[PDB]
Amino acid sequence: SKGEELFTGVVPILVELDGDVNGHKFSVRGEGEGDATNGKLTLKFICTTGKLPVPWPTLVTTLVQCFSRYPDHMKQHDFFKSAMPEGYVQERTISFKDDGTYKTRAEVKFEGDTLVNRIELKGIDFKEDGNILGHKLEYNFNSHNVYITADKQKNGIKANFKIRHNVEDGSVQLADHYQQNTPIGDGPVLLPDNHYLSTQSKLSKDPNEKRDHMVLLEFVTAAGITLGMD
Amino acid sequence: SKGEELFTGVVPILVELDGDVNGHKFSVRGEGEGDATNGKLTLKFICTTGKLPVPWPTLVTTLVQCFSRYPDHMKQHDFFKSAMPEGYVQERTISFKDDGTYKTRAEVKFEGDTLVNRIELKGIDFKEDGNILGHKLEYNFNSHNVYITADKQKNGIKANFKIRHNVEDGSVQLADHYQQNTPIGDGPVLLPDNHYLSTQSKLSKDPNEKRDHMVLLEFVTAAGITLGMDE
8 A cells, every 4th residue: 555655664653642531631742753664663651741640551552553564465454554644543442340441532643754643531430449540550561479478387488379371362371370488408597578579571582593492581579568667 | 598698699590390291291491590689580491302382481480589689678588598508499389270280399409509490390181272282372471462353334443452451469450442443534445354463562661751651662563364375
């Protein structure tokens, strides 16, 4: 298509969101650039009314699928770029389990040289105790909290946490871990008070490696214990 | 309690795993280095007996929490470094829902200068049609598929997908997404055969930005259609 030719290079992006969640009105502005040749987006978003009343992760999918990399044998299936530069409307209903709902209406157009995503958002029926208005969602997507407790009868520690592996069909494969650590030597060990480990893992592959392999990068920090009149 | 002193610098890591899942024996070796000062690990793992009979993401938790960064006011709660260099035994039971069960016994200790994680794993009761032995697990944790289908009545598409936001207490906040796109223009558009966009996002913060903000990095690739008959 001809609209495809507008994404041959790097295209500046402007996002403008105006939202209203349970009466709390807010606005977001974002700026950055997209590179459909590699399917890469870089964006910075700013709340321009003060503090966001909902967590940032719940707004990621609302804040430009025309920057997807379509492999060559699929270029004829790229609805998104084919609609440019006049653009497309994008409507969504986002239903949070046991909580409120976002309704979403964006226009994704070209304004001059710039790809613009201009959104209205309306969230209703959110629970003030819930995970959204109560601000309980982790910020990085892959952050798992591993809650550690001491077990003085065993001279060690215990933990139990859930990993929910993404399944290729959009399903999830739950993995329920029960952990038990005990010292190998008979010297003294620090048994802890209740805290947790915030863990992040990034998996990747080395394309120059013939063997079945995993390249893993991990960031782990302990949390859950604050200062107490120090 | 003098064990934290062994983790002040960068420490070479050796990981060795002997496994048996539904009678398939395998072995993994892992090499790399850990930096407890920053809570950082970089490791490369190689299946040394051919192909791995399970998805790599199911082995990650099995394959060294003594490299976590304990803030200064908590160093008194660091069991893992405290048990060093004799080390600790780590036993787990991993229960895959509607599927089998891993049991793991590892010994994490210092052999010479190197921190060695030495595991024995046993998995029983796995379904051959299941997500594990059937290798249906995404490799990257933040990879989501946005499933796309044509809606020719409105001259556009329609998409559907789920996002599972992690909650601080360890549960998950599910978000069902129902998407509809139509063109603004009057010109002609491509209507697609069913496919999906494979989407990944990384979120971060500018420490020097005083306003409430989000810095976002995204990688999206259409997939789910294959080359036809040709060469």
